[PDB]
């Protein structure tokens, strides 16, 4: 019994993402924190933050149980606030859950960079990629370069033998690289070939995976990738991390955004967990739900794991004790 969201026409891709973001408590706690986060003594009062508060308003309502029976909320109050930022939706290619996620995450960062004297905390989807290069003839490395991400946007690999595609294969295809053939070394003082390491250095608490299922064909038409990618409820990232030590990172599923159909009958939808606050506001549930705009329905886990994922909202956990 989570509230639905009204969709008339053009606004399903937002609803599906909202239902996803609402499944990540750390994002709601960051917003509860962020919107209340101020610094004493500073003489300049802080700049206001309509987006952070409008987004918390909705996600807090989708996070708790319904209050009025089968209630359906209206998130058009959010659409107006985003237009106060640069976002002007101008093509059908932009009616997308991932695109919006990157519009939202950028517009939150505008608000962190808005009030500058008071310290605002960095959002829990933030992580870093690291690139590094090692030479084969001397076994030594360059100093690293860093990079940032809000989502690991995995391109889908093409088939070779015909084994099932796994999320591990779409990740290792992305977090990996080739060798360069002509540039000099330092330890070998003079022309050389070295290996391009790509790994992730900072891991966010809320991990957004993205499967590039929607792209443009050879001659510009919308191309959809239909093949299924196998994923699990718990996911371990210890093989993609830079620091070479025995500490462990483990993530647990919170929501799966899914794209059904295409063009005329294309649609976004969300699998997500039921609210935890069953008088026990800390106990993350194991009953899954299927939400399509104003429609809410129970769903088993085998229903989630069989669906064709578009966005996966993983959240970090310490141990697998469920």
């Amino acid at each position: 019994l989570v509230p639905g969201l009204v969709n008339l026409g053009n606004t399903c891709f937002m609803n599906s993402l909202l239902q996803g973001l609402s499944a990540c408590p750390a994002f709601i706690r960051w917003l509860e924190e962020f919107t209340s986060q101020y610094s004493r003594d500073q003489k300049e009062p802080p700049s206001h933050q309509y987006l952070s508060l409008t987004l918390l308003h909705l996600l807090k309502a989708l996070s708790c149980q319904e209050v009025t029976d089968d209630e359906v909320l209206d998130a058009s109050c959010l659409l107006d606030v985003l237009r106060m930022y640069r976002w002007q939706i101008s093509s059908f290619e932009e009616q997308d859950a991932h695109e919006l996620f990157h519009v939202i995450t950028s517009s939150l960062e505008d608000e962190r960079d808005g009030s500058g004297s008071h310290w605002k905390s960095q959002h829990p989807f933030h992580g870093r990629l690291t690139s590094n290069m090692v030479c084969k003839h001397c076994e030594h490395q360059s100093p690293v370069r860093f990079d940032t991400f809000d989502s690991l946007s995995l391109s889908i690999p093409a088939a070779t033998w015909g084994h099932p595609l796994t999320l591990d294969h779409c990740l290792h295809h992305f977090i990996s690289s080739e060798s360069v053939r002509d540039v000099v070394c330092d330890n070998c003082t003079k022309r050389t070939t070295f290996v391009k390491q790509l790994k992730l250095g900072k891991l966010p608490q809320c991990l957004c995976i993205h499967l590039q299922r929607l792209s443009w064909s050879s001659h510009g038409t919308p191309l959809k990738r239909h093949e299924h990618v196998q994923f699990n409820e718990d996911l371990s990232m210890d093989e993609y991390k830079y620091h070479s030590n025995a500490s462990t990172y483990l993530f647990r599923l919170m929501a799966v955004v899914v794209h059904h159909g295409d063009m005329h009958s294309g649609h976004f939808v969300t699998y997500r967990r039921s609210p935890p606050s069953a008088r026990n506001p800390l106990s993350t549930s194991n009953q899954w739900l299927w939400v399509s705009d104003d429609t809410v329905r129970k769903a088993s886990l085998q229903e989630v794991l069989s669906s064709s994922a578009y966005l996966l909202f993983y959240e970090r956990v310490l141990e697998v004790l469920f």
Partner: antibody
Amino acid sequence: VQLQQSGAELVRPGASVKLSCTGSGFNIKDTYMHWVKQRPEQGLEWIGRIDPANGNTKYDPKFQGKATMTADTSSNTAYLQLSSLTSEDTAVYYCARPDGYYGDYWGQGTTLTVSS
Amino acid sequence: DIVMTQSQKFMSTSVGDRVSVTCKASQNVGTNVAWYQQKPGQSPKALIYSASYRYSGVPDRFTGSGSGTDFTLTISNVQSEDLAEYFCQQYNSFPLTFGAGTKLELKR
């Protein structure tokens, strides 16, 4: 649900041969499908993948000038055609067809032999 | 091309034992290694498709592990059914390549 192959054969060096496969479940062009070469010392080697919905296959570049591939759908016969045999071109040839739930389907082997 | 070094042609085990045949690849192949089984006179059987994932009809005795370059197939509580040839196979790149094949035997 088997994937039967053609019986074995024997030829002199310098000749050419062609093999066959067919199974008791369709999706023939609705899947990828492979041929591999097994001889005891060197071992298993992959030679190519067929795209039976069409026919512009991918070969191993150490085979392309010596192995060629075709197939048919309404009659489920996928073929292999290889040429200019030496006695070194003797091996058991398997044709394989992937599946996602079960382990991928393999056929009863075809044991090409070549000598003077 | 890419090749996988298998550790031996031959490994010795007990019944009810734990055994670990391995593969080492020429370059980073991600998670894209598959493990196969072949008993004399038979066609091969697929055991594990990603580095760790089991097919249907495969006992919990079999587990796969590894990433990038060093990979392992482990059989625990080895049964008398598990005396066969074991290959590993890449599907990261074209051409697809195997190992040499490892036979298993009861020590005595």
